[PDB]
Amino acid sequence: PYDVVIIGSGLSGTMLGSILAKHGFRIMLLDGAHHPRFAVGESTIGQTLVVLRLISDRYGVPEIANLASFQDVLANVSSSHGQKSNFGFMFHRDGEEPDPNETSQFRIPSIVGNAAHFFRQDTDSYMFHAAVRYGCDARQYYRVENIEFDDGGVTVSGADGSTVRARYLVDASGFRSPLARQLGLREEPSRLKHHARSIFTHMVGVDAIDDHVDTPAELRPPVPWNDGTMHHIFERGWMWIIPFNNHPGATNPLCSVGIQLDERRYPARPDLTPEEEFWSHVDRFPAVQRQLKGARSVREWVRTDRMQYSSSRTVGERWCLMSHAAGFIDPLFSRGLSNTCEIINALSWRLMAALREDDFAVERFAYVEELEQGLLDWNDKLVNNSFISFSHYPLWNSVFRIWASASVIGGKRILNALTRTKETGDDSHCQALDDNPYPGLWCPLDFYKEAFDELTELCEAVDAGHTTAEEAARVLEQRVRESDWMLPALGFNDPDTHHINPTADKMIRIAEWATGHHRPEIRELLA
Amino acid sequence: PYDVVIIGSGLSGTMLGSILAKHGFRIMLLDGAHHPRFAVGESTIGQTLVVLRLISDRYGVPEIANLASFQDVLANVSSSHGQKSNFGFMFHRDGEEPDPNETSQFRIPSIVGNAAHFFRQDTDSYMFHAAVRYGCDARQYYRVENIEFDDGGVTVSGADGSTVRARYLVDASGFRSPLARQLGLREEPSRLKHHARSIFTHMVGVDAIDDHVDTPAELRPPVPWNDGTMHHIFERGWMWIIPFNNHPGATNPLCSVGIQLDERRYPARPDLTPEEEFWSHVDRFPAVQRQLKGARSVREWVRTDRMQYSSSRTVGERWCLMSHAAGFIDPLFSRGLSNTCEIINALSWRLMAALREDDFAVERFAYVEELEQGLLDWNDKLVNNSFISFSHYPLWNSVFRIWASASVIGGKRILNALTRTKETGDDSHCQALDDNPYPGLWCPLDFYKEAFDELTELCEAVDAGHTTAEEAARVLEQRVRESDWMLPALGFNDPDTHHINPTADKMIRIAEWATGHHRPEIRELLAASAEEVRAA
Ligand SMILES: [Cl-]
């Protein structure tokens, strides 16, 4: 009898399995697929980086920390990954060249860490190898036919006629989660406001967008577009360029390429090949067409329908529906892996407590559910606001600086809690982060929520037709200029600064500016 | 319509894909799997390294040359690969510690290149990406339902209802070859003498064998066992240890582990799990048991029925049955990839000429079939001779030095042709290698065939019970000491030298020894000065 059976051998499953196996619990991993296998969720963000470090140090699994830095990934996982110096955004309209005043860039500051483009076949192989090394058992090419709970534990039945007996079940799989299907956990219809279907593949011979735009020198970004994740924004959709070869002597010549389309505004074209439908969108935008001219697909194309789903319950007695099994919004802002790390941090210690005491009263896991549903709802608002804003750059510009400002604040809030636990060898300061009033919010301060609440109200009003994008942009631009908290030294309070470039000098001035600030939160976090 | 449709997205199909696509031909790759995917054939040899460079240089595909060197594989493919400094051999008997006087090592000389342990998932992905970049079209998860030939070309029918029209078909897949099935090309029963079934996986936490034997200091090998492919030899079978992490700061912690068993001596155990049957053999050999003590499988185990298969013919009107779709012997001595490289070299230019003339007369590809069948037959004896010899170390000792000696002579032969073609810029010298009387024989020299023809006759006689292994070993050990060609400075003519260690100084003397040698072949291939050796 296993302590925990985990469905899903992805990062979500194998990071948890590693944690539980290292602390001496008996784990079984089940997955219908076999490593090596392709996976999406390739771009990283500061919050993923710091919470990966938090989980690694808190639970004593060094392999998880090797994902928290571009340098450690190359050194420990594989050479086959790309760098992420920045988030890049470029507006396009049908037939037109991109207006060089309708771009945004957020260079990631060194304080949160060196972000990467994850070649997921290698990162997911790496963490599975670690999970098996720590003592996890594994069955790959394993189809779950039935999941049956009782007072003693759970019996998983496989297609091959085998059964796995355990005390607890975690479903860390995706959309086709057996637990979600078999217990009827999915919300139908979904509560989520964001709508987007997807077409994606891996390509060879993708050029840098830098080399295919005619940008006046003074409007070129501080660091190259190709050194980060490029976002090609248009009416109710966007395209990602995530290169793996964007650094000197890079071994992996592939580039991850996909398009998110609101299926309400871009209806299905089943007369077209996934490839043909993808290229029909490329042909709308001259600069994107020029970037992808030589590019050739090295995979069978994936074409989805509406990608978004939610669940009504995510915990029960002796089971947890984790992260990607519970819900999904969109690739935009690589929220998925941040959400996965937040849940693993929250679930791991509680589940180990429950196993030690042999008490599976669902009350102990009440916060895990609250965090899960909160993460999804805030993620929903962020992406829905953004898709709405894509119709009018001046409105997007507000969404951009409200979203990106939180990276540095929310980032240092976690780093502070971790350094206090590091220096004092006491896990009270990391545990203190859970004592926050807005579960799921990436910068859970009162002034930020109020600010983001207004952004959501106006965006949702634009979407309903109660306000115009011009009026909403007008109001949010006033609020930004009236703001006192938006890291002025970096230019987040300045709508005319499109390329936020955090230098060494500027972060010093942020610290000085923060020292004598009237808001307690700004002093606590940034001084 | 495509010029060529290639069935198989492994190195065999994608290396050929790259060559044809690079020369401006319209190519389609069809495979039932999708990259990334696991594959075997992980260890490399001198002949593979040198012929990879010949192919790359001859056909102008630089990516193929990046497989020909450990350093170039890490730099261009991925960091996920291991080094191969030597072939290691260690004899084991049930319940007993390994006898340190019953080991063999062959350190691979610098001249033939730096060998690797290929993590094939990254190796096969790399070349597939190259093929597509060169302009190959590909369909993955493509199941071939039907193949039919007319006078104008060939039609391939997919299970999804689609069809692919081409002028020529190459089947570069494996055992379940759609082309061999369609035309009933497989020999039943197979003509092959070698018998072996297999259990294999990838494991994490495999220790070095060096750290789990108490070998006397004077009998320890010049270079570590773990820096190469270790062969745990036993009665009518052997186990491979192929670590991907056998070098400083290596990223890939996996080690490839598998066992070959003569299915006539070890009958199937369907009452056991593949894992259980594998561990039942590990537990026979205390030293192996200590090596794998902490090792855990990271894949679903493979267990085979009997791996050897052969074809009655391998070329026809507008089709070729290529390397692994034609036949297979054994993982032993990593002959699989050498055979693939040899066929690609022979077929590529012949196929492109035929396409350009629009003439597919089977007489054009006569040498491709002769080479295909020859590679397999010689591969068959080498492994069968080795499997017979595993019963008695003194007999194996003669198989080892006859095999490993040819790997330096035959290697230098191709390398001479290669460096001469680069100097003159003239392909003549590389094509001249096809002008040998023994197609498929890795060292195609009169004296070497006679030596190997005897080793085979004796080995096959031991197997048939007409001679004892002791009697066979005695006759062969005489021939070795009567020999005048077995690279004395390296110790190939010395049965009491088990660990061959080709160093800079020893290779200088081979050159001097070769100068004014009574045999012309020895002079032509090995003869040089200590001035020309400086370069290296
Ligand atoms: Cl799924």
Swiss-Prot record, chain A:
One GO BP annotation of this record: antibiotic biosynthetic process
Keywords per UniProt: Antibiotic biosynthesis, FAD, Flavoprotein, Oxidoreductase
Source taxon at top rank: Bacteria
Transcription regulation in keyword set: no
Pathway annotation from the record: Antibiotic biosynthesis
Record EC number: 1.14.19.49
Record has Transmembrane helix as a keyword: no
UniProt-listed Gene3D superfamilies: FAD/NAD(P)-binding domain
Binding site for FAD: G8, S9, G10, L11, S12, G13
Any one Pfam family match given in the protein's UniProt record, by short name: FAD_binding_3
Gene inactivation effect: Cells lacking this gene accumulate tetracycline (TC) and abolish the production of chlorotetracycline (CTC).
Gene Ontology MF, one: oxidoreductase activity
Reaction catalyzed: tetracycline + FADH2 + chloride + O2 = 7-chlorotetracycline + FAD + 2 H2O + H(+)
Role according to the record: Involved in the biosynthesis of chlorotetracycline (CTC), an important member from antibiotics tetracycline (TC) family, which inhibits protein synthesis in bacteria and is widely involved in clinical therapy, animal feeds and aquaculture. Utilizes FADH(2) supplied by the flavin reductase CtcQ, to catalyze the chlorination of tetracycline (TC) at C7 position, leading to the production of 7-chlorotetracycline. The enzyme forms a lysine chloramine intermediate on an internal lysine residue before transferring the chlorine to the substrate.
Subunit structure: Homodimer.
Family classification: Belongs to the flavin-dependent halogenase family. Bacterial tryptophan halogenase subfamily.
Protein name (database record): Tetracycline 7-halogenase
Organism: Kitasatospora aureofaciens
Lineage, highest ranks first: Bacteria, Bacillati, Actinomycetota, Actinomycetes, Kitasatosporales
